[PDB]
Point group: C2
């Protein structure tokens, strides 16, 4: 039997905060061997830790479990098996981390300096580029036809010289065109 190693699933994509495991399966002799996992940085992973878990199942398999995934867990992980005579073989598995459209920081209420230049904060995270739309009472602010309203490149909404009749509920809406994903956060703007 020519020493061989495989990982199942052969690849994976874990959503932020969720968990997945990968089995390193060996096909070699019928003896004892060493199966070691290495993280993307090329460093060996210690077994039995609670979040980035490496558990020994039997002589021919070790399981890697990435619990409560975060974007920094992304990368090519490697499993290397060393038979008793020193012979080695390895397999790699590319792990991607996916961040669905979410609002990292969209405070409410958001109070403002009357007559001052307001900037409504809306920090969005998403692996896929989102298209942002700001609404007031469910209507795209761009339709107000007011030069004072400008959507900034960081998705924040600027309202120059804000007035009281500008107060109300502003929704920061994110969509992923052609894929159908949408999420929003309603923000109470107070003047």
């Amino acid at each position: 039997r020519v020493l061989q190693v495989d990982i199942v699933p052969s690849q994976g994509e874990i959503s932020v905060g969720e968990s997945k495991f990968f089995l390193c399966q060996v096909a070699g002799d019928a003896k004892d061997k060493d199966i070691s996992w290495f993280s993307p940085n090329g460093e060996k992973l210690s077994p039995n830790q609670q979040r980035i878990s490496v558990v020994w199942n039997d002589d021919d398999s070790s399981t890697l479990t990435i619990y409560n995934a975060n974007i920094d867990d992304a990368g090519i992980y490697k499993c290397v098996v060393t038979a008793e005579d020193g012979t080695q073989s390895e397999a790699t598995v590319n792990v991607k981390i996916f961040q669905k459209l979410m609002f990292k920081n969209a405070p409410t209420p958001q109070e403002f300096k009357e007559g001052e230049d307001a900037v409504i904060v809306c920090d969005v995270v998403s692996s896929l580029p989102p298209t942002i739309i700001w609404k007031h009472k469910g209507r795209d602010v761009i339709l107000k036809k007011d030069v004072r309203f400008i959507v900034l490149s960081n998705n924040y909404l600027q309202i120059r010289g804000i007035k009281k009749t500008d107060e109300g509920t502003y929704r920061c809406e994110g969509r992923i065109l052609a894929r159908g994903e949408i999420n929003f956060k309603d923000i109470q703007v107070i003047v």
Copy 2:
């Protein structure tokens, strides 16, 4: 006439939202665009949970917010043109429940000598396999007939002893997808 829906098919996670754009190869032509739910109901423009929004002469958008299992099914976009003839497109909407725990009370207390039932309610669109652990070790390794995993995944410990106290893990896995989730439950005797 031609009718198209994008995304062509969609899977919405329970509690999340997804939108579907119905587009007609529009032109200088009058025509009506309407959305119908899986049960055949005509969905009218609204800004409610099952939203329908008129975009322009050639398109209307259906948005399903805070999706629940009863929203599953084939939705239909029909385009009736000038006389009363029609064309359609359909989109199959799946509601996806990821491997999660509806209930996993902690701690859970039982009286020594009593038959204890440790509560763990797991939900998942895809049927998972359950493993119960005590101190991080699979309970079957005890080879103790007092430990029985019930049909609903609850862990029963007959005549629970003080020595059975500790951290139990109700772990669910979906091998086919390499998915896993768990909840630790403190058992007090």
